[PDB]
Design a protein around this ligand. Structure first.
Ligand SMILES: Nc1ncnc2c1ncn2[C@@H]1O[C@H](COP(=O)(O)OP(=O)(O)O)[C@@H](O)[C@H]1O
Ligand SMILES: Nc1ncnc2c1ncn2[C@@H]1O[C@H](COP(=O)(O)OP(=O)(O)O)[C@@H](O)[C@H]1O
Ligand SMILES: [Cl-]
Ligand SMILES: [Cl-]
Ligand SMILES: [Cl-]
Ligand SMILES: [Cl-]
Ligand SMILES: [Cl-]
Ligand SMILES: [Cl-]
Ligand SMILES: [Cl-]
Ligand SMILES: [Cl-]
Ligand SMILES: [Mg+2]
Ligand SMILES: [Mg+2]
Ligand SMILES: [Mg+2]
Lengths: 499, 496
């Protein structure tokens, strides 16, 4: 319910207040016109009012359509595109394309169709048309939106109205951005408590990762600020409950998921993992309770405080980190490891979704750490009748104790893993675009969470503490903020030239 | 209809191509946002998109409407405007006015109503809102239009398709601006002929005056350029013939005008005269054949080659110049003179419109220069029965031999002149806005209407004068063109 007082603060500035931003922002084509939604929108507006870029604009939009069309409609759409843009006497013929690119796009019917064409289209728009844009009013209007994006949007802008859950350092609240009305989760981390338990590194790591990655399969950070008592992270609201609750607490009589449901989540998790691994992040804490459902029933990975980020030229890390019963053998043996650890945990996760128990312990079995370690290292997992051959086999490939022999991330992707018979009926293209109907959709009228019921001493803050807080409170994330402006109509309202 | 090839060249430039133009541009509020159509238009777009200036914008638009309304419609528009903008809890109450102006506009009457209000409104808009506009995209858009205005637009942009008339130095053509389709008159002056007959001064004076004045009652220059053979003035097309033609050649057996028709043109010519006189220009060649008619029937003065622009702080001048029979006594006596000379010509002109002859010569009576001069100087004019009490007295007041006794230009205006009973039935306000219906609407279907010179070679001084003359495009009329023909609307889109 948009609070008008804060809505009134979303106004475009005079141009003289954008001079500093002009001289300081990364003016990269890819960053500005493809990844930042307002920048893309304004660039397309520029292309739309400049006749000579009409073909490039239209083709670009029509490839995106093709890329997210239903299977049955793709042949027809392929035909329309080739007729509109690739036949030489067509009104919207794209004469800027090399004839080789064109000829190649007029042939074939493969999965890659129109991807080299898109590259070509985007390569072209990154040259002259981009330059022309930078020299247009449309770019100046972008600077106006970036100015507004940089303006203080701290605690007062958010109305907390419910507790979604509890973490180690504070609660997570459902909240509302007052100006726009958009709902988010706000993870609150208590400052004194954080300092006391030396949680800076994990807190900062989660925030840096949630800020830099932009995946539909990982919770997105929109805002990061501090208050007198907390550090706060405002991120994607995930109202559907976590996988653990859904495994055990939704329908207690029949714990676990039917196979198709378990496969769907695995595919979504695999996609989130791939997105991390491509950017050299090892997650190190995949488990059912960290995979959250949204209202549509799509899942995302969360809780990134144990993650590690490999630096340039570093292919392995080391260290005892994670949740017991999800930590790979190579990790437990004190060896170097890479992304492999996450695929082992994916295996335990899949195992648990089908079997409604972990593969190394009986129900309610509470063991010494060393006993659990020896089971992970030495004990072969057994699979009950519930497992189909495909599920058994996939789990066996993931729970492989030797990381060399384990299914996972090879050649910069999970494509190998995607060919496994278990995903026989998944359209990966549609999964990645979010077009699939999830097999389970949470009831809006249900709270899918265990029930909720509501100072540490002798902690004074030195300079190094407040310096860490100010680093952490980096503020507004461009991409999510721009999504918000667009989604909620504010961009529409404010981006006007004449009514 | 437009020629697409030339329409193609009307594109807004990249912003960086406007930075030189931005450095050199010296325009205040009045110049930018009130005088230049496009600037006004973009300034108003700005006010319209910023809620807080809504009241100012609408009160402004509504005062302009009251200023041009028919007489019978004014009281209701006065009441509506007071109720919309001058009452404290009206939605568009104008908070920024001082209560002293609010009170004054809230309870007046007569021709002066809302002019003190408009001044206050415009003064307000010229402060913060104007400063806001300079810091907006709308100002940069204006700079882009000015860039475009300044781009080469010479002979290739103009298709001549018919001869309108013949002058001393060449033909005048009906022509089309190829990009926009707009029709113009293109007066061509042959270069070799100008040099040979020593007409540079007269060419340039005409050009300069038409460029610097902007009145609905004087032909407007949109472009000045040169071809290999000619200097060219592209100006307002006047398709209704000239007044001389209409006096004598239309209904030959009933020559001259019915009095109201004469009064209408006198009123319009006076408006032209006044505009010139307010800008320190003396016409020195007011006569029936120089007053042209447009398609609607409205008239403009034309042919400004014998005119003179007084230098700043100069009040009188000298120079035997003009057409015999229209040159006033003081001019003929060799004395210093001012604008008075033009009111004398207006006397002669009006006289002729009524009598179908000039005041000093019977029909076909051709006399020596000295004899005509002596009549202008000594002869008292006689008035037949075709003149009414009012006509006669007005001509008498205009034809006074002594410029000090003569009706004309006082305290910076013709307001005295306007008060003559001859103008009993004329709304000067509506006339000056172009609102009055003309009493004669010329037919479309009627058109109411050289040799290469030897020994001429051109030197440095000649082609330099030609480049000085060829000053290019005139802002206001160009902006008027772009707005009228829809090019402004088409290129000003942000998202179609
Ligand atoms: N994006 C979210 N949407 C909804 N609930 C969330 C979200 N993130 C966390 N939560 C809830 O709050 C709890 C604590 O958050 P989490 O990030 O897991 O904290 P910690 O790092 O302390 O484990 C979660 O177990 C979950 O119930
Ligand atoms: N703007 C115009 N529209 C239509 N016809 C015109 C226009 N200007 C001039 N003419 C015609 O061309 C003739 C010559 O123009 P003019 O300016 O009088 O040339 P000059 O200065 O050599 O006398 C005019 O008498 C008139 O018939
Ligand atoms: Cl192909
Ligand atoms: Cl292709
Ligand atoms: Cl632009
Ligand atoms: Cl287990
Ligand atoms: Cl007033
Ligand atoms: Cl703006
Ligand atoms: Cl005469
Ligand atoms: Cl004579
Ligand atoms: Mg955590
Ligand atoms: Mg002439
Ligand atoms: Mg002349």
């Amino acid at each position: 319910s948009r609070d008008r007082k804060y809505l009134a603060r979303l106004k475009l500035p005079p141009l003289s207040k954008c001079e500093a931003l002009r001289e300081s922002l990364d003016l990269g084509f890819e960053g500005m016109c493809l990844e930042q939604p307002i920048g893309k929108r304004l660039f397309q507006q520029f292309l739309r009012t400049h006749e000579q870029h009409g073909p490039a604009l239209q083709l670009w939009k029509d490839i995106e359509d093709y890329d997210t069309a239903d299977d049955a409609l793709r042949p027809q759409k392929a035909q329309a595109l080739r007729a509109a843009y690739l036949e030489p006497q067509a009104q919207l013929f794209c004469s800027f394309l090399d004839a080789e690119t064109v000829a190649r796009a007029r042939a074939g019917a493969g999965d890659g169709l129109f991807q080299p064409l898109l590259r070509a289209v985007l390569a072209h728009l990154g040259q002259a048309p981009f330059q022309e844009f930078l020299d247009s009013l449309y770019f100046l209007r972008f600077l106006q939106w970036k100015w507004l994006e940089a303006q203080p949007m701290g605690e007062d802008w958010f109305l907390d109205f419910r507790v979604l859950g509890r973490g180690g350092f504070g609660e997570v609240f459902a909240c509302q951005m007052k100006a726009t009305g958009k709902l988010y989760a706000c993870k609150k981390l208590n400052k004194k408590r954080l300092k006391k338990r030396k949680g800076y590194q994990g807190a900062m790591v989660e925030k840096k990762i949630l800020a830099k990655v932009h995946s539909r399969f990982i919770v997105s950070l929109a805002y990061a600020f501090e208050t007198k008592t907390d550090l706060c992270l405002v991120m994607t609201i995930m109202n559907g409950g976590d996988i653990r609750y859904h495994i055990y607490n939704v329908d207690e009589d029949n714990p676990g998921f039917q196979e198709p449901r378990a496969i769907f989540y695995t595919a979504q998790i695999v996609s989130g993992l791939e997105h991390l691994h491509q950017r050299n992040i090892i997650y190190r804490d995949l488990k059912p309770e960290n995979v959250l459902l949204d209202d549509d029933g799509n899942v995302r990975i969360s809780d990134l405080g144990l993650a590690v980020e490999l630096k340039a030229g570093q292919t392995k890390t080391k260290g005892y980190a994670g949740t017991p019963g999800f930590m790979a053998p190579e990790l437990l043996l004190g060896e170097e490891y890479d992304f492999s650890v996450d695929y082992f945990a994916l295996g335990v996760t899949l195992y648990e979704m089908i079997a409604a128990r972990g593969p190394f312990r009986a129900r309610g079995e509470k063991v010494e750490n060393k006993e659990l370690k020896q089971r992970v290292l030495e004990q072969a997992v057994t699979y009950p009748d519930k497992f189909s051959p495909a599920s058994k086999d996939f789990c066996e490939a993931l729970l492989q104790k030797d990381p060399e022999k384990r299914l996972g991330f090879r050649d910069g992707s999970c494509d190998g893993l995607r060919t496994h018979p278990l995903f026989r009926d998944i359209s990966w293209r549609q999964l990645e675009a979010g077009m699939l109907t999830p097999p389970f959709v949470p009831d809006s009228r249900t709270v899918y969470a265990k029930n909720i019921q509501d100072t540490v001493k002798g902690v004074a803050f030195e300079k190094a503490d407040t310096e860490f807080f100010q680093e952490f409170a980096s503020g507004t994330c461009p991409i999510p903020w721009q999504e918000e402006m667009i989604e909620t109509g504010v961009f529409g309202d404010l981006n006007v030239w004449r009514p």
